[PDB]
Design an enzyme around this catalytic site. Structure first.
Site: not given
Ligand SMILES: N#CCNC(=O)c1ccc(-c2ccnc(Nc3ccc(N4CCOCC4)cc3)n2)cc1
Length: 265
Positions: A14, A130
């Protein structure tokens, strides 16, 4: 990426204008896996040590099987590090959209996971979220547990340009919200998510913003598409989440005791 005392940072998961979330393996453990949100200190409205750590204490105490855990909080010379439970299934938005729809049985399991989280939070007067499938994550693709996430770090780690940063997605926002409004906006949101899971898109999905606005400001009750046909209970729940007059919308008490939701799993 950043180097950290305790972890090795692998993939980017992210990105924000100011933040970046990497996946990470604990150094000396490797089977231990986290997600780490990194934010430069220069991007933040500076705050008391009292106030910030107080807020981190409060977030770390928000511990539920269907809420992403904040495990630890670290910092160095440049950044802060919010160390979170890694969810390996990605977000609920990809999950629905790549499968087009979810059948009622699956929707149901998911709603009772999300409602059990919401009841817990409601008990604690935590609210005005949200909620949307992009902030809901999956424990795995195997028999997934949904996890509510906070994609917008706030309060005492807010940015300097908070009054110039736009908050909410309007496809998931309760109309009273977009136009004085209590935590019953979260129940609307739950409705949108259920509807998006069964029918494949939020009720107000639109080519354009004027089209969207039209729908948000309208007084028409939301029409459920004809297919899939759903049980009388699912349809009752969904109609009552997607009621525009918050006074007329289902109570939290009724939502939690609603037959379709169980909460006697
Ligand atoms: N900076 C910014 C905006 N994003 C966040 O705040 C955010 C993004 C991810 C997570 C988070 C937390 C725990 N696990 C994960 N897992 C996760 C695994 C795979 C993916 N994707 C796989 C497919 O492509 C996109 C990413 C996204 C999240 N993400 C928490 C906050």
């Amino acid at each position: 990426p950043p180097r950290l005392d305790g972890f090795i940072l692998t993939e980017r998961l992210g990105s924000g204008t100011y933040a970046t979330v990497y996946k990470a393996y604990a150094k000396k453990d490797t089977r231990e896996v986290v997600a780490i949100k990194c934010v430069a200190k220069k991007s933040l409205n500076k705050a008391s040590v009292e106030n910030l750590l107080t807020e981190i204490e409060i977030l770390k105490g928000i511990r539920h099987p269907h809420i992403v855990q904040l495990k630890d909080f670290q910092w160095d010379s440049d950044n802060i590090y919010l160390i979170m439970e890694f969810c390996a299934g990605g977000d609920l938005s990809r999950f629905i959209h790549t499968r087009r729809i979810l059948p009622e049985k699956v929707a149901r399991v998911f709603m009772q996971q999300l409602a059990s989280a919401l009841q817990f939070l409601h008990e604690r007067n935590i609210s005005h979220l949200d909620l949307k499938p992009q902030n809901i994550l999956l424990s795995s693709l195997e028999k997934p547990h949904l996890k509510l996430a906070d994609f917008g770090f706030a309060q005492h780690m807010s940015p300097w340009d908070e009054k110039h940063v736009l908050r909410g997605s309007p496809l998931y926002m309760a109309p009273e919200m977009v136009c004085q409004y209590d935590a019953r906006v979260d129940l609307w949101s739950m409705g949108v998510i259920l509807y998006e899971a069964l029918f494949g898109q939020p009720p107000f999905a639109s080519r354009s913003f004027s089209e969207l606005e039209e729908k948000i400001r309208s007084n028409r009750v939301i029409e459920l598409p004809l297919r899939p046909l759903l049980s009388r209970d699912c349809r009752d729940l969904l109609q009552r989440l997607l009621e525009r007059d918050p006074s007329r919308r289902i109570s939290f008490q009724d939502f939690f005791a609603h037959p379709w939701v169980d909460l006697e799993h």
